[model samples]
Target chain A: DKIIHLTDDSFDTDVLKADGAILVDFWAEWCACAKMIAPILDEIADEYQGKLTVAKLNIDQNPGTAPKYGIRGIPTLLLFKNGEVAATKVGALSKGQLKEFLDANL
Target chain B: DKIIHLTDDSFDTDVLKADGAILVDFWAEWCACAKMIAPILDEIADEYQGKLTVAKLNIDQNPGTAPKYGIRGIPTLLLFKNGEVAATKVGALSKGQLKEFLDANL
Candidate 1:
């Protein structure tokens, strides 16, 4: 199982047009927090597999969608359910905390 | 100190026109979490004193501004710095957690 890499060109087709809930992690390479959470998302990507899809977007490489989503904080996670934003949270969370966010939203 | 009760009639005067940062708790009387956090805001109101002010707007009665601000969740906290929304968070937070929010914003 792998997290899909989404570019500005493919954000709509990959995230919005897709079915079920998708978690889009708006991250940057320079961010240590994004580095830390990358593996957790990988773990989620593995476990949630068919139930949910975890995708990553490098905001630095794709600045357009970041501002559109109001992602001023680094390592912000936006949970898009179907085509709409269900929830958003800034900062990093432990795996347990991440589970809480996931459980609450999903 | 009392939580400044704001109506659609007085939202601008009490919250928007106020100085420094304002944390407005958009809640309803039936909400248990709002009841839980009320005392916390009272303490914050006492502690911050003049530096900051805490306010409340009942979504049930004050439907106009609540929808205008896009407050879908009860006890949704909106932190306004001057006249603009600086940050927003849904759900409840402990007093300690609230302190962190205050510290981060102010």
Candidate 2:
């Protein structure tokens, strides 16, 4: 299961046009906090693979996407459905927390 | 003459405890979008210094504060008048646009 990489060029096609529940991870390589949540995201991605489309976005490479989604911090998770942001989570999280977040959003 | 730096530790004292209006800027140094709005924030800070207390919070250092305000993106400006959040503006903006936001919020 591969996570879709959402970049400035493919943002619309990948994220905006995504069907069902779309979870976008707004992150940057240099951000330690963003790195901390990798495992949690991986777990959630695996657990909700078919049910949700988990997309990862590198803020450094895709500057336009975060602002458009109103992402302020690293590791911000945005839940999008029907081309609109339905829910958001800011900051790093543990696997359990991430699961809970997904459960609530889904 | 100086901009008050608000952190997680000092958020309550500086922002919530202030006597007058407060403009809280939730930003992170690594964020390019945050950097883009520096000039606009500076001008707004200077112009509304006495009228409205403009404070800056580094999301990296003051992680707790940003989450408390439900900040989702860098350059997120929150207008705190009368010790509570009166209005909020998400994303970067031009100096003129920031001024207009301030005018309408203030």
Candidate 3:
């Protein structure tokens, strides 16, 4: 029930080749959209414990990885499965939308 | 030579029907790209005083206008001439790029 924080250096070993479905939330402190989705992600993180690995990477602090992933926006979610991105969602989503996104990927 | 801060309610009179060419920087404080262009925009505001009006609209604070303008990204500079958008430059640009964008629009 924790969101693993990622850095530029750790992204490759962590989310890319993680064990199961890792939902990486590319976010920043100043983004309202990112803020809006925070609690929803937290809830999802707790609810889907073993099934999903919820992670967060601060785009401001870890600038390198986002550009490599073509992340031009905040609150961009990437569902990585078996070292490959399986699903992507940009911008803030409603709880329902989030559940649907996770359902598809999970 | 001030960077006029705008809001949803003040956008029309303050920007659309302004005195002359107005460059509106659509941004959010959480965005590093927006932060990168801030000082540059400030310099431009001072240098082009009277000739060009430099303004900033925090997308986080005033969310209404950005979507209307199709601003899906931060650091989106929209050059307005005669109350219409004349030019747009998205993302953080170098000083040269900033000047070039200004030259083309202003």
Candidate 4:
């Protein structure tokens, strides 16, 4: 429930304009690795409820956003802070790695 | 047979003085994730026997080399080419991920 879904239309308002740190996961339905990180993102969303906002954007559905962010790979995570891209991670990271990524960036 | 074991004493000669691209896995006996990558490393060693040399170093057994490489984590992989460290990756990676890492560097 903590994780919010984002589309191309709502990208700016939901992530760029959102408060604090928001992690936008650029993923696709057909990607196995992207699906692998889905549940781990859920755990992060719940754990860092107040500290960070975890959001997912399906590349297939929102093609515009992925290109805008230079997302060449599936399961790319972009940590946005104050309407700008703070950090970028490409690939399916384990829960521990994801946490470390968040902790280092956030 | 492709994967060779390294110790603190033999690290310099085996890796630094060795030939071509060599992937040295800095691991520990008690690390679960390190053990998880063991079979995967075996696959890589056998598959890319001529192209790459897959080597393993147990941190607990050979503490000196780990500190020299600033290995703060288990399953840290250091890729050396022409006796110089070309790339470094920390944490356990899936076989696919490991292959990608190797392909990009090697």
As for candidate 4, its clashing pairs are none
| Interface RMSD, per-candidate values to 1 decimal | 14.3, 10.1, 9.0, 13.1
Model 3: per-residue Cα lDDT over B58-97, one tens digit each = 8888989999988876657889987888889766666788
**What TM-score quantifies how close candidate 4 is to the native fold?**
0.54
Report, for every candidate in turn, its global Cα lDDT versus the true structure: 0.78, 0.75, 0.81, 0.82
Q: What tens-digit string does per-residue lDDT give for candidate 1 at B1-106?
A: 4678899899998877876788888866433332244588889888887777888888779888978887655568899988789998775676998889888888
Ranking by TM-score: 3, 4, 2, 1
Q: Model 4: per-residue lDDT, tens digit, A12-85?
A: 89987877888998876545456667889989999998888889998888899988876666678899998899
- Which residues of candidate 4, in runs, are more than 4 Å off? B1-106
Native-contact recovery for every candidate?
A: 0.00, 0.00, 0.04, 0.00
Tens digit of lDDT per residue, candidate 4, span B1-28?
7789999999889989986999998876
DockQ for each numbered candidate: 0.02, 0.03, 0.06, 0.03
Best model per TM-score: 3
Off by over 4 Å in 1: B1-106
Clash totals for all candidate models: 0, 4, 1, 0
- Candidate 1 C-alpha error for residue B62, in Å: 43
